[PDB]
Design a protein around this ligand. Structure first.
Ligand code: W95
Length: 133
Protein backbone atom coordinates (compact mmCIF):
# COMPACT_ATOMS: atom_id res chain seq x y z
CA UNK A 1 0.00 0.00 0.00
CA UNK A 2 2.83 2.23 -0.92
CA UNK A 3 1.20 5.12 -2.65
CA UNK A 4 -2.37 4.12 -2.28
CA UNK A 5 -3.72 7.65 -2.06
CA UNK A 6 -1.84 8.66 -5.31
CA UNK A 7 -3.07 5.84 -7.43
CA UNK A 8 -5.68 6.63 -10.09
CA UNK A 9 -6.39 8.89 -13.00
CA UNK A 10 -6.07 12.63 -12.50
CA UNK A 11 -6.81 15.69 -14.68
CA UNK A 12 -5.12 19.09 -14.56
CA UNK A 13 -7.39 21.83 -13.21
CA UNK A 14 -5.14 24.82 -12.48
CA UNK A 15 -1.62 26.04 -13.00
CA UNK A 16 0.38 28.98 -11.67
CA UNK A 17 3.84 30.24 -12.70
CA UNK A 18 4.43 27.29 -15.02
CA UNK A 19 5.74 29.35 -17.96
CA UNK A 20 8.30 30.86 -15.62
CA UNK A 21 9.25 27.46 -14.28
CA UNK A 22 9.81 26.18 -17.79
CA UNK A 23 11.84 29.29 -18.67
CA UNK A 24 14.04 28.67 -15.65
CA UNK A 25 14.53 25.01 -16.67
CA UNK A 26 15.60 26.21 -20.12
CA UNK A 27 12.65 25.26 -22.25
CA UNK A 28 12.48 27.18 -25.57
CA UNK A 29 9.69 29.47 -26.60
CA UNK A 30 7.69 27.24 -28.92
CA UNK A 31 7.83 24.27 -26.56
CA UNK A 32 6.80 26.47 -23.62
CA UNK A 33 3.79 27.76 -25.47
CA UNK A 34 2.49 24.35 -26.58
CA UNK A 35 3.39 22.62 -23.36
CA UNK A 36 1.83 25.39 -21.30
CA UNK A 37 -1.41 24.89 -23.17
CA UNK A 38 -1.51 21.16 -22.36
CA UNK A 39 -4.13 19.81 -19.98
CA UNK A 40 -2.61 16.43 -19.09
CA UNK A 41 -4.19 13.37 -17.61
CA UNK A 42 -1.77 11.84 -15.04
CA UNK A 43 -2.27 8.10 -14.45
CA UNK A 44 -0.48 6.63 -11.44
CA UNK A 45 -0.36 2.91 -10.75
CA UNK A 46 1.58 0.50 -8.57
CA UNK A 47 2.43 -3.14 -9.17
CA UNK A 48 4.54 -4.58 -6.35
CA UNK A 49 7.45 -2.22 -5.86
CA UNK A 50 7.18 -0.63 -9.26
CA UNK A 51 5.36 2.71 -9.57
CA UNK A 52 4.32 3.91 -13.04
CA UNK A 53 3.35 7.51 -13.84
CA UNK A 54 1.90 8.25 -17.24
CA UNK A 55 1.17 11.82 -18.47
CA UNK A 56 -1.02 12.09 -21.46
CA UNK A 57 -1.85 15.31 -23.34
CA UNK A 58 -2.05 16.69 -26.78
CA UNK A 59 1.56 17.95 -26.30
CA UNK A 60 3.28 14.65 -25.40
CA UNK A 61 2.51 11.25 -23.90
CA UNK A 62 5.15 10.16 -21.38
CA UNK A 63 5.55 7.14 -19.13
CA UNK A 64 8.05 6.49 -16.34
CA UNK A 65 8.35 3.36 -14.18
CA UNK A 66 10.59 3.23 -11.12
CA UNK A 67 11.31 1.90 -7.69
CA UNK A 68 11.49 4.43 -4.87
CA UNK A 69 15.02 5.55 -4.15
CA UNK A 70 16.49 3.86 -7.25
CA UNK A 71 17.85 6.21 -9.93
CA UNK A 72 16.79 5.92 -13.53
CA UNK A 73 17.44 7.67 -16.78
CA UNK A 74 14.49 9.69 -18.19
CA UNK A 75 13.90 11.59 -21.44
CA UNK A 76 11.62 14.44 -20.41
CA UNK A 77 8.77 15.73 -22.57
CA UNK A 78 10.91 18.74 -23.46
CA UNK A 79 13.72 16.36 -24.54
CA UNK A 80 16.17 16.73 -21.64
CA UNK A 81 18.17 13.59 -20.87
CA UNK A 82 18.11 13.50 -17.08
CA UNK A 83 18.98 11.21 -14.22
CA UNK A 84 15.98 10.95 -11.92
CA UNK A 85 15.31 9.65 -8.47
CA UNK A 86 11.85 9.49 -6.89
CA UNK A 87 11.45 9.00 -3.13
CA UNK A 88 8.62 9.21 -0.59
CA UNK A 89 9.38 11.77 2.12
CA UNK A 90 6.75 12.17 4.70
CA UNK A 91 3.94 11.18 2.37
CA UNK A 92 5.19 13.45 -0.48
CA UNK A 93 6.49 11.94 -3.72
CA UNK A 94 9.74 13.82 -4.43
CA UNK A 95 11.11 13.60 -7.99
CA UNK A 96 14.58 15.07 -8.55
CA UNK A 97 16.01 15.42 -12.09
CA UNK A 98 19.73 16.08 -12.62
CA UNK A 99 21.30 17.07 -15.93
CA UNK A 100 24.17 19.27 -17.08
CA UNK A 101 25.05 20.30 -13.52
CA UNK A 102 21.44 21.50 -12.93
CA UNK A 103 18.66 20.13 -10.81
CA UNK A 104 14.93 20.51 -10.54
CA UNK A 105 12.42 18.95 -8.16
CA UNK A 106 8.79 18.02 -8.70
CA UNK A 107 6.82 17.24 -5.50
CA UNK A 108 3.43 15.53 -5.55
CA UNK A 109 1.16 15.50 -2.51
CA UNK A 110 -2.43 14.67 -1.71
CA UNK A 111 -4.31 17.64 -0.26
CA UNK A 112 -8.06 17.16 0.30
CA UNK A 113 -9.43 15.55 -2.88
CA UNK A 114 -6.61 17.02 -4.99
CA UNK A 115 -3.17 16.02 -6.04
CA UNK A 116 -0.98 19.10 -5.85
CA UNK A 117 2.25 19.28 -7.87
CA UNK A 118 5.00 21.75 -6.96
CA UNK A 119 7.81 22.28 -9.47
CA UNK A 120 10.94 24.10 -8.33
CA UNK A 121 13.98 25.28 -10.31
CA UNK A 122 16.29 27.60 -8.30
CA UNK A 123 14.05 30.35 -6.86
CA UNK A 124 11.13 29.65 -9.24
CA UNK A 125 8.19 27.59 -8.11
CA UNK A 126 5.10 26.57 -9.92
CA UNK A 127 1.95 24.92 -8.52
CA UNK A 128 -0.26 22.62 -10.56
CA UNK A 129 -3.49 21.14 -9.22
CA UNK A 130 -5.03 17.90 -10.35
CA UNK A 131 -8.50 16.47 -9.60
CA UNK A 132 -9.74 12.88 -10.04
CA UNK A 133 -10.83 12.17 -13.60
C1 W95 B 1 3.84 19.64 -20.00
C2 W95 B 1 4.86 18.90 -19.08
C3 W95 B 1 5.15 17.52 -19.74
C4 W95 B 1 6.18 19.75 -18.83
C5 W95 B 1 7.12 19.91 -20.02
C6 W95 B 1 8.31 20.82 -19.63
C7 W95 B 1 9.02 20.31 -18.42
C8 W95 B 1 10.15 21.29 -17.97
C9 W95 B 1 8.08 20.09 -17.25
C10 W95 B 1 6.96 19.17 -17.68
O1 W95 B 1 6.07 19.06 -16.53
C11 W95 B 1 6.00 17.88 -15.89
O2 W95 B 1 6.73 16.92 -16.12
C12 W95 B 1 5.02 17.84 -14.73
C13 W95 B 1 5.06 19.04 -13.80
C14 W95 B 1 3.93 18.89 -14.74
C15 W95 B 1 2.56 18.43 -14.21
O3 W95 B 1 2.53 17.54 -13.34
O4 W95 B 1 1.59 18.96 -14.74
Amino acid sequence: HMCDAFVGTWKLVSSENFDDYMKEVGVGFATRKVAGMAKPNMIISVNGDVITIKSESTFKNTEISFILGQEFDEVTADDRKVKSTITLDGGVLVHVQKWDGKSTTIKRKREDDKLVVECVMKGVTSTRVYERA
